[PDB]
Amino acid sequence: YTAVATTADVLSAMGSSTAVSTVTLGSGITSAAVTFAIATTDSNNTWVDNK
Amino acid sequence: YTAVATTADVLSAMGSSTAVSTVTLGSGITSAAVTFAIATTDSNNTWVDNK
């Protein structure tokens, strides 16, 4: 009642990278981010929310 | 004629990759580092002085 809880189900849905591209290719104010290389040898990449 | 002149040139005479490996392996008290990825995935590797 001070620290907040959450129920979570790992649906494993949304898995197809084609759907991931489409949803991240057009949203509202959703500024996403991807780390897409070696943990030693990477950074983060955001985008414009709407496209 | 008081301060020594400098005629610095880009020689690249140390260009051999195996040569660079040897110099970075048998170096003295050094802190040589490698940048080996593009800026979105860039990283720096820092290793011991002579190993």
Q: What phi and psi, each to the nearest 5 degrees, are found at residue A30?
A: -80, 100
Residues A38, B40: C-beta atoms closer than 8 Å:
no
The amino acid present at B30, given as its one-letter code, is T
Judge whether A46 is closer than 8 Å to chain B, CB to CB.
no
Asked if A40 has any chain B CB less than 8 Å from its own CB, the reply is yes
Interface contact B41-A37, CB threshold 8 A:
yes
**Residue of A22, A43, A18 whose CA lies nearest to A33:** A43
Task: Please tell me the distance from the alpha carbon of residue A22 to that of residue A8, in angstroms, as a whole number.
Answer: 24
Residue B20 has a CB neighbour count (10 Å cut-off) of 13
Q: Which value in Å is the resolution of this experimental model?
A: 3.7
Of B39, B40, B43, the CB nearest to A40: B43
Name the pairing type of β-strands A45-46 and B33-35.
unpaired
> Do residues B21 and B47 lie in contact, with contact meaning Cβ atoms separated by under 8 Å?
no
Look at the block and give the residue holding tokens 């040897």.
B22
- Technique of determination: cryo-EM
CB A41 within 8 A of CB B43: yes
Flag if A41 and B40 touch (Cβ within 8 Å). no
Element (H, E) at B45: strand B44-46
Considering all CA atoms of chain A, what is the largest pairwise distance in Å, rounded to the nearest integer? 41
Type of residue numbered A24: T
Which of the 8 DSSP states describes residue B5? P
Among A34, A33, A44, A42, smallest CA distance to B38 is for A42
